[PDB]
Curated annotation (Swiss-Prot):
Catalytic residues (UniProt): D79 (proton acceptor)
Record-listed substrate binding positions: N44, D53
Residues carrying the site annotation Transition state stabilizer: K41
Section of the entire sequence shown: 298 to 460 of 460
Recorded domain comment: Is composed of an N-terminal sensory globin-fold domain that binds heme and oxygen, and a C-terminal GGDEF diguanylate cyclase domain.
Lineage start: Bacteria, Pseudomonadati, Pseudomonadota, Gammaproteobacteria, Enterobacterales
Name of the featured protein: Diguanylate cyclase DosC
Species of provenance: Escherichia coli O157:H7
Length: 163
């Protein structure tokens, strides 16, 4: 089962604290992908939890197929995910986030009647800029996610001082 490999949210602090410390001592880039499945509750209602669950499996599979073993993937809510990319440049991060978003879009799902289920991700991305507090890094990545949702979903957004 792919869903059992996912990390609980409670491990975010202890993991981020250590992973940030390492990124400052060495000067290696660090990035975060915050992901939320588009209109998931609406999908969960219409097609059922078995369908919602299978969606979470396909979506989780897309993650592990496009991250290293050295990266971390967390699942907090029903459709809420957090990916920590250790040692990934901005160029690499956006490329990774794009591979993930595209994969989910191009995964068509057959319904009970035989129709197609619309799948898409919204992804917020943010680069580590040296700040010691990890919550700041999650805040801006979540803010980036907020915009991707606000701008019509099925897209990636990178956090900037402009907003």
């Amino acid at each position: 089962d792919v869903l059992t490999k996912l990390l609980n949210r409670r491990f975010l602090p202890t993991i981020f604290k250590r992973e940030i410390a390492h990124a400052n001592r060495t000067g290696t880039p660090l990035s975060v992908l915050i992901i939320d499945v588009d209109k998931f509750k609406e999908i969960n209602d219409t097609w059922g939890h078995n369908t919602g669950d299978e969606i979470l499996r396909k979506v989780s599979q897309a993650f592990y197929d496009n991250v290293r073993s050295s990266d971390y993937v967390f699942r907090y809510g029903g459709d809420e995910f957090i990916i920590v990319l250790t040692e990934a440049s901005e160029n690499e991060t956006l490329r990774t986030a794009e591979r993930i978003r595209s994969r989910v879009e191009k995964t068509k799902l057959k319904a009970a009647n035989g129709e197609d289920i619309a799948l898409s991700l919204s992804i917020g991305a943010a680069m580590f800029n040296g700040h010691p507090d990890y919550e700041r890094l999650i805040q801006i990545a979540d803010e980036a996610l907020y915009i991707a949702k606000r701008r019509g979903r099925n897209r990636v957004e990178l956090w900037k001082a402009s907003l």
